[PDB]
Amino acid sequence: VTNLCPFHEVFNATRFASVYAWNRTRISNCVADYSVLYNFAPFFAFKCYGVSPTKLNDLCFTNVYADSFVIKGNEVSQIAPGQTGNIADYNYKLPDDFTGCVIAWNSNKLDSKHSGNYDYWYRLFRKSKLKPFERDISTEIYQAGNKPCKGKGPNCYFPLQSYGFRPTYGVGHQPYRVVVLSFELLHAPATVCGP
Amino acid sequence: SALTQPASVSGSPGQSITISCTGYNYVSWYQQHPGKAPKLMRFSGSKSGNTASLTISGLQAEDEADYYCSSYTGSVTVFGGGTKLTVL
Amino acid sequence: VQLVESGGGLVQPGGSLRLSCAASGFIFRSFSMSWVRQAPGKGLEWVANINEDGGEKYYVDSVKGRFTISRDYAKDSVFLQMNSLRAEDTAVYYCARVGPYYYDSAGYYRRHYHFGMDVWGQGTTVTVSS
């Protein structure tokens, strides 16, 4: 084993991207050792769909996709196939047949500056519901009424709102970092396996 | 967690008057005249810990109304006692 | 934008009524809706709240689970069924939309929204008496 999959960057990045513009990293052509994942952070909401976690070292996939972002405590449960809300509807939606794992852990220490960590935004309004595995980084003013908007107004709203993360909040409002691993095997031989 | 407001505040026309609301990041202010539904809110808002404040500059005759502070957080909203402003 | 309340009137205690809130001029599938009552001679008081999809319904403790508030995307309106009416329940009811149109203080640059009840309907009167 000489080429370990670079999980040292996904679970230990200096800062994570906003949920509406969640970051996607591709992991391939490497040996995947998930046993070290528990050493990265005290995982709170580890959950795998379509695959038993204890057998993660005994499977192979063509490519792995890590989608990393930051949400609130209440919105962690929205990261699941067939779920609805704000994050699952207008920010980041998983397919109904999703296969992979979800790892969510608290980051109250790194994403709470006591004055409002307003660098993490989420999409509040959208014309339609987000398609699975789609990013909508568009920043056009949202129209709620019938009049033209061409900018902010009484019924013309900015689609993105900034989280007000602070360390004084409860566990339900403290920021949580989420990494969703999706496993894919289309045609190519699996370049990702276990030890 | 009902909010606290002064019973009534009075001031001279054209004078800046401050109304306090003591109880938390989302706070809204509404104005209501008799016979009409309340309306969302020369008016300057500020927040400090568990206290919010609304200052009115350039008081006029038409500004006689009742002002309410609310805290819409999570999914439960709580209204204050209502401050009936008096214009001299 | 326009909100119109209807379905109020006079009722004996212990009855069941239905209040209807018709919305126009804005998209109904994006704004959470709240019902707030005001007794004559008193201030406002929250009654009920529902999100856009209606899957999260919340009520004040003073009404327990006696009232049932719902919304449907078909007719684009809100409805509130009233059960076990009491003497202290007679009030004028308004339905409002929780819209982030409110921008409080200089935090506009920081892009922080204060979700308030920007549009209030004319409300309907429910008088619980013999």
Author numbering:
A (entry chain A): 329 to 523
B (entry chain L): 2 to 24, 32 to 49, 63 to 109
C (entry chain H): 2 to 131
What did the authors write?
XBB-7 is more cross-reactive than XBB-2 and XBB-6, with little reduction in potency for RBDs bearing mutations at 455 and 456; however, its potency is reduced ∼8× against BA.2.86. We determined the structure of its Fab in complex with the BA.2.86 S trimer by cryo-EM at 3.6 Å resolution. This antibody belongs to the IGHV3-7 gene family and also binds at the back of the RBD in a similar orientation to XBB-2 but is shifted toward the right shoulder. Only three hypervariable loops form contacts with the RBD, H3, H1, and L1. RBD residue 456 contacts a proline from H3, leading to 4-fold reduction in potency for the F456L mutation in EG. However, the further adjacent mutation, L455F, seen in XBB.1.5.70, compensates for this, so there is little impact on potency. The RBD is rather mobile and not well ordered; however, it is possible to model and refine the structure of the RBD and it is clear that the numerous mutations and the deletion of residue 483 do not introduce major changes (RMSD compared with BA.2.75 RBD for 188 RBD Cα 0.56 Å). Although the ΔV483 deletion has been seen before in SARS-CoV-2 sequences, the deletion of residues at the edge of the ACE2 binding surface of RBD has been very rare. Such a change might cause epistatic knock-on effects, reshaping the ACE2 interaction surface in a more profound way than simple amino acid substitution. However, we find that the structural changes are minor and localized; the presence of a disulfide bond close to ΔV483 appears to lock the loop, limiting the propagation of conformational change.
